[PDB]
Design a protein around this ligand. Structure first.
Ligand code: SF4
Lengths: 57, 118, 232, 57, 90, 457
C-alpha cells in the first residue's frame, strides 16, 4: 500500500500556519509529508528508500 | 414631372445602362419621396416594351422593409402598409453604385444642428 | 499620360475577360468570386476567378496586348467549341480611334464610362442561352495594322534582363491567322449566318473604345451540338 | 545502480541540447515551460497565492 | 514629403503595421497562457504572469515573443506613433 | 395576389402631401451632455502607450476594491447579531477558519476551470510557428471553489450551481460546512450598489452595429443604403414618426478585413464607401461612430477613437472641430448622456471574450443576457482582463456609477431585459450585427422601450 508518488516539504512550526493545508489542497491527489528540518527530511528519504528497496535510482 | 421624369428615366435606363432609383428622381427634380413614388408608378404604366425589371419593396406594420423577389407569393398580405417601385433595373443583377449627393435642397427631414465652417 | 491610361485599360480588359468567362460558363461559376479589388480598384463588383494559374494567364495576356496596343486596333475574345474547332461566339473590343498621347480626365469619369460599358456587356450576356459544363473554351485574337511576330528569335540574341526576356516571349507567343478562320466554310445546305450585336462603349477623354459581339445563331447540324443546354 | 538520464539519452538519441525540456519535446512530444531559479524561489515563498505554489509543485 | 501630403495612405499603412504586430503578440500571449495552464491550472490573471515568467530557450515561441516585445518597444514604433499623432493633429 | 394589384392599390392613391420640401421639419434635438464634459475614463494617451507589464497592479487594485465593496455590503446585510435558522452567524476572516457546524460568511474570489474552446486553440496554433499541442496540454474540474489568500474551500449546493461565474470574481459566500472539506452555500452576496443618476417628448436613438463593409459582399452596401433612406424618411414616408429619431449610433465593426493579409488599397476602398454613406446621411441625422474588433483600431478593449484621417475629403467640414454635434468619434466603451439618460455602450468584446471559454460549471440569447446581467452585478465591464484589456497605465472598467441603459453590440442575437440590482433599474440591450440579420434597434428615451426594425435584402 504505497502511492507511487510523493512530495516532501520542510516546514517548521515557526513559519506561517495553514501552509500544509494549502499545499495539501493544491495537490489533493499526491500525498505530501512535512518535516521540521532538512535533516529529518533526509532521514525520511532514507527510510523510504529502505522500505521500497529499489534496484535503480 | 410629366414629360421630364420619363425622359430622365429613359435616358438613365437606356442611353447609359444604370439602374434608376426614385431617390435619383428626388435629387433631380427636387421633389418629395411620395411624388417620386407616384412618378415611378406612372412610368411603370404606358410602357409596351418591358425592357426593365422593376424592383419593389413592401413596408409592413412592424417596419419590415423587404425586397420582393418571388413576385408570386407575398407573405402577410394584410400586414403590408406601403408598396412602391424602389428602382428600375435593366438587368437581372441589381448591384447599384452610390456616390456623393449634393443634397442642397432635397432634404425632407433636416437635422437640428447646422453645419459651421471656419 | 499613359501611366494612368495603361492602368485603366488593364482594369477594363481584366473586367471584360472575367465577365465573359463567368457568364459563358467557360469556367465553373463557383471559382468566380464577386469582388471590387483585384490588385486594382474595379469599377463595380465584377466576378473575378480565384484560380492562380488562370489569374496569371489573364494578366500575362492583358500585358502582352497592352505592350503592342499601338499597332492593335481590334482585340477579340473568341468562344470555341471543344468538340470541333469552331468559333461559336465572338466578343470584340474595338480600339480604333483610341487616342495615344504621352502628354486631365480623372478616374471617377473614366470609371463611370467603364461602369456603363460593362453594364451593357452584362445585360447582353445575361440574355444569351446557358452553356453546359466542360464543353467550351476561349481564344484571344488581335487585329494589327503594321507588325510581324515570331521573327525576333532569328538573331540568336541572349537576354540579359527581365524586360528583354518578356519582350522576346511576347514577340513569339503569337501565330499568324486568317480572318474568319474558325467559322464554318459555308457548306450551302442552309448556310449559317453570323449575327452581329452592337453594345455601348466608353468615350472618356483619352479612351475611345467601341464594343460589339458576334454569334453564329444558326447551323447545318453538327454545330452547337450539346453545348447550349438543349432548349433552356 | 545509479543512472544519469541525460547521459543515457545522449548515448541513445542524436539531439542537440539534451535538456529536460528539449528531450521531453523531442521524445515525448510535450512542451514544458522553463522558469529561472529566481522565479521558482520567488513563487515558492510563503504568503504567496495558491496558484504559484501549485505551479512550482 | 509626398507621403506626408497623402495623410490617408500613410495613416492606413501605419495602422496596418501596428495592428499586425498587436495581433501577432496577442496570439503569442494566448499560446503561452495555454501552455502555462499545464502548471498553473488557472485561466485568469496570475496565470498570464506565470506564463510571461517563462524563459525556455528550447521553444521558438519564446524567441518569437521576445522579438515581438522588442518590436513593440522599439524606437521605430515610437517614431511611427509620433508621426501618427502629428498627422492626425489637424 | 398579383403585385400589379398591390401597386395599383398603394401607389395609385398616394397622399402627395406634407412633402413640400421648401421648409423641411427639424429633427428632434438630442444632445450628448458628455460631449464637452471631457474626463473620459476610457481615454488613454498614446505617449504613455503599453509596456507589456504592470498587469499585477491592476489585478491587485481590482481585488482590493471589490473586496472592500463586498465586505461593506456584507456588513450592511449580515450585520452583528444576525441569526440564521440553525444558529447565529459569525464573521469569518480566513477561508480555512471554517471548522465547525456553525453558520458563517466570508469574502473571497471564485475559482473555476475556464478551458479554451477548440476552435480558439486551432486558430492560435496555426499562426504561431512552433505552438505545441495545446489540446494535449489541456488533457478537468466541474466544481466552484472560493479563494481568500489563505486557502481554498470547495463550494457545494444548488444555489451556486445555478449562477454563471468567472475566475477572480470576489463575492461573499454564506452557508454551513459540509461533512467533507466542502462549504455549503445558502446565500450569496455582491458588491454594494453604486449610485445612479436620476431618470429624465424627448426622442429615439437608433442603434446599429456590424455593418462589416468589405470588397466582396455587395448586399451589405445595399442594406446600408436602404437603412440610410429609411432614416431620412424616404422609405417609411411617415415623416411624423421618422423625425423622432434624433441620433444614430454606430456601435462598431464598420469594416471587416483580415489584418494578416490586407493592403491599404482595399481598406481605403471600404473606408471611402463608409465615408460616402456618412456624407450622404450626415445632413439629415447625427451619427456617432464607435470602434470595433475588426475595425482599424487597437486590439485592446479601450479602443481609441477613429483617426481624423481614413475619411474622404468631403468630410473636412465635419472634421473642422467646432461641429462635433453632427459627427462624433468616441472610444469603444463610452458613456452617452443622451438628453439626461446615461447609456453605457461597448462593441461587445467583453461578452465575446467570456463566451470563448468552456466553463463546465454553468450559446443562447438568454445565456448572453445573463452574462451581461452578471457583468453589471460584478460592477466590472471586463471580467477576463488577460483576454480583453492590455497593459493599463496607472482601472476604468471597474464601475463607479450605474448607467440607465447598457448596450453590448455585435452579438449573434437580439435581446433586451430590465434588471433591478439593489433597487436600481438597468436596461440591458443586445445589439445584433447588420451584415447578418440586418436589424436595427430603435431606443425610445422617454419610456426606455426598445423596438426593432428589420431590412431584408
Ligand atoms: S514559451 Fe514556449 S514554452 Fe514557454 S510558455 Fe510560451 S510556449 Fe510554453
Amino acid at each position: 500500500d504505497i502511492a507511487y508518488e510523493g512530495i516532501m516539504i520542510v516546514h517548521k512550526a515557526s513559519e506561517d500556519s495553514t501552509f500544509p493545508t494549502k499545499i495539501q489542497h493544491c495537490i489533493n491527489e499526491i500525498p505530501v509529508m512535512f518535516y521540521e528540518s532538512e535533516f529529518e527530511m533526509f532521514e525520511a528519504l532514507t527510510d523510504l528508500v529502505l522500505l521500497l528497496d529499489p534496484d535503480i535510482l | 414631372m410629366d414629360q421630364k421624369a420619363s425622359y430622365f428615366i429613359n435616358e438613365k435606363l437606356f442611353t447609359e445602362v444604370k439602374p434608376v432609383l426614385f431617390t435619383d428622381l428626388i435629387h433631380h427634380l427636387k421633389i418629395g419621396p411620395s411624388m417620386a413614388k407616384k412618378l415611378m408608378f406612372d412610368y411603370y404604366k404606358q410602357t409596351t416594351n418591358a425592357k426593365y425589371n422593376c424592383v419593389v419593396i413592401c413596408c409592413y406594420k412592424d417596419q419590415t422593409i423587404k425586397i420582393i423577389h418571388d413576385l408570386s407569393n407575398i407573405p402577410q398580405q394584410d400586414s403590408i402598409i406601403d408598396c412602391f417601385i424602389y428602382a428600375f433595373n435593366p438587368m437581372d443583377s441589381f448591384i447599384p453604385y452610390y456616390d456623393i449627393i449634393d443634397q442642397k435642397d432635397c432634404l425632407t427631414i433636416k437635422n437640428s444642428y447646422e453645419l459651421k465652417v471656419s | 499620360m499613359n501611366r494612368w491610361v495603361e492602368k485603366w485599360l488593364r482594369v477594363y480588359l481584366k473586367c471584360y475577360i472575367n465577365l465573359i468567362l463567368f457568364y459563358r460558363n467557360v469556367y465553373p461559376p463557383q471559382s468566380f468570386d464577386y469582388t471590387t479589388y483585384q490588385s486594382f480598384n474595379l469599377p463595380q463588383f465584377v466576378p473575378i476567378n480565384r484560380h492562380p494559374a488562370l489569374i496569371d494567364y489573364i494578366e500575362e495576356l492583358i500585358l502582352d496586348v497592352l505592350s503592342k496596343l499601338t499597332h492593335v486596333y481590334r482585340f477579340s475574345i473568341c468562344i470555341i467549341n471543344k468538340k470541333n474547332d469552331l468559333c461559336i461566339e465572338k466578343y470584340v473590343l474595338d480600339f480604333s480611334e483610341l487616342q495615344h498621347v504621352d502628354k486631365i480626365i480623372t478616374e471617377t469619369e473614366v470609371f463611370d464610362e467603364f461602369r456603363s460599358s460593362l453594364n451593357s456587356l452584362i445585360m447582353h450576356l445575361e440574355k444569351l442561352p446557358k452553356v453546359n459544363d466542360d464543353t467550351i473554351t476561349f481564344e484571344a485574337v488581335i487585329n494589327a495594322i503594321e507588325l510581324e511576330l515570331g521573327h525576333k528569335l532569328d538573331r540568336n540574341r541572349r537576354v540579359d534582363s527581365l524586360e528583354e526576356k518578356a519582350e522576346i516571349e511576347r514577340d513569339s507567343n503569337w501565330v499568324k491567322c486568317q480572318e474568319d478562320e474558325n467559322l464554318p466554310d459555308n457548306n450551302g445546305f442552309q448556310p449559317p449566318k453570323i449575327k452581329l450585336t452592337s453594345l455601348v462603349g466608353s468615350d472618356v477623354g483619352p479612351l475611345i473604345i467601341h464594343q460589339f459581339s458576334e454569334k453564329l445563331i444558326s447551323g447545318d447540324d453538327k454545330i452547337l451540338n450539346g453545348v447550349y443546354s438543349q432548349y433552356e | 545502480h545509479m543512472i544519469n538520464i541525460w547521459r543515457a539519452l545522449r548515448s541513445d538519441v542524436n539531439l542537440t541540447q539534451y535538456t529536460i525540456e528539449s528531450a521531453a519535446f523531442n521524445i515525448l512530444h510535450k512542451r514544458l515551460p522553463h522558469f529561472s531559479f529566481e522565479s521558482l524561489t520567488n513563487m515558492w515563498n510563503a504568503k504567496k497565492s495558491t496558484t504559484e505554489l501549485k505551479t512550482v509543485l | 514629403d509626398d507621403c506626408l501630403e497623402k495623410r490617408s495612405t500613410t495613416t492606413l499603412s501605419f495602422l496596418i503595421k501596428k495592428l499586425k504586430r498587436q495581433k501577432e503578440y496577442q496570439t503569442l500571449k494566448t499560446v503561452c497562457r495555454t501552455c502555462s495552464y499545464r502548471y498553473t491550472s488557472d485561466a485568469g490573471i496570475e496565470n498570464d504572469h506565470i506564463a510571461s515568467k517563462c524563459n525556455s530557450y528550447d521553444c521558438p515561441v519564446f524567441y518569437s515573443r521576445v522579438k515581438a516585445e522588442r518590436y513593440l518597444r522599439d524606437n521605430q514604433s515610437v517614431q511611427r506613433e509620433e508621426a501618427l499623432i502629428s498627422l492626425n493633429d489637424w | 395576389l398579383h403585385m400589379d394589384a398591390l401597386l395599383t392599390k398603394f401607389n395609385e392613391d398616394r397622399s402627395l402631401q406634407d412633402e413640400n420640401l421648401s421648409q423641411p421639419r427639424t429633427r428632434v434635438r438630442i444632445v450628448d451632455d458628455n460631449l464637452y464634459n471631457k474626463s473620459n475614463p476610457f481615454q488613454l494617451c498614446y505617449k504613455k502607450r503599453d509596456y507589456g507589464s504592470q498587469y499585477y497592479h491592476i489585478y491587485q487594485y481590482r481585488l482590493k476594491t471589490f473586496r472592500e465593496r463586498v465586505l461593506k455590503e456584507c456588513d450592511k446585510r449580515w450585520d452583528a447579531g444576525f441569526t440564521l435558522n440553525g444558529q447565529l452567524v459569525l464573521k469569518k476572516d480566513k477561508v480555512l477558519d471554517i471548522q465547525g457546524n456553525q453558520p458563517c460568511w466570508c469574502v473571497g474570489s471564485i475559482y473555476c476551470e475556464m478551458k479554451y474552446k477548440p476552435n480558439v486553440l486551432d486558430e492560435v496554433i496555426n499562426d504561431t510557428y512552433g505552438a505545441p499541442d495545446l489540446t494535449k496540454s489541456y488533457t478537468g474540474s466541474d466544481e466552484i471553489m472560493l479563494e481568500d489568500e489563505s486557502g481554498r474551500v470547495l463550494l457545494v449546493g444548488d444555489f451556486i450551481r445555478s449562477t454563471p461565474f468567472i475566475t477572480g470574481v470576489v463575492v461573499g459566500i454564506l452557508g454551513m460546512e459540509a461533512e467533507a472539506g466542502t462549504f455549503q452555500v445558502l446565500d450569496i452576496c455582491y458588491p454594494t450598489p453604486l449610485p445612479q443618476n436620476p431618470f429624465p417628448t424627448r426622442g429615439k436613438i437608433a442603434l446599429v452595429s456590424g455593418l462589416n463593409l468589405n470588397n466582396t459582399s455587395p448586399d451589405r452596401l445595399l442594406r446600408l443604403e436602404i437603412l440610410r433612406e429609411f432614416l431620412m424618411g424616404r422609405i417609411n414616408n411617415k415623416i411624423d414618426d421618422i423625425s423622432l429619431i434624433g441620433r444614430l449610433l454606430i456601435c462598431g465593426n464598420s469594416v471587416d478585413f483580415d489584418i494578416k493579409s490586407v493592403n491599404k488599397d482595399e481598406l481605403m476602398i471600404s473606408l471611402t464607401e463608409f465615408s460616402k454613406f456618412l456624407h450622404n446621411i450626415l445632413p439629415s441625422i447625427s451619427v456617432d461612430i464607435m470602434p470595433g474588433t475588426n475595425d482599424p483600431s487597437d486590439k485592446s478593449l479601450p479602443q481609441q477613437p477613429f483617426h481624423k484621417s481614413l475619411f474622404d475629403k468631403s468630410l473636412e467640414s465635419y472634421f473642422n472641430g467646432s461641429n462635433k454635434e453632427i459627427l462624433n468619434l468616441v472610444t469603444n466603451p463610452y458613456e452617452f448622456s443622451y438628453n439626461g439618460v446615461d447609456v453605457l455602450a461597448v462593441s461587445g468584446k467583453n461578452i465575446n471574450d467570456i463566451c470563448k471559454y468552456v466553463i463546465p460549471s454553468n450559446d443562447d440569447i438568454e445565456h448572453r443576457l445573463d452574462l451581461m446581467e452578471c457583468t453589471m452585478k460584478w460592477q466590472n465591464i471586463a471580467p477576463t482582463a488577460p483576454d480583453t484589456l492590455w497593459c493599463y497605465p496607472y482601472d476604468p472598467f471597474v464601475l463607479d456609477k450605474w448607467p440607465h441603459v447598457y448596450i453590448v453590440a455585435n452579438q449573434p442575437y437580439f435581446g433586451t431585459r430590465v434588471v433591478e440590482i439593489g433597487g436600481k433599474n438597468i436596461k440591458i440591450i443586445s445589439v445584433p450585427e447588420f451584415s447578418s440579420t440586418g436589424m436595427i434597434i430603435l431606443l425610445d428615451l422617454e419610456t426606455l422601450e426598445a423596438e426593432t426594425v428589420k431590412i431584408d435584402i
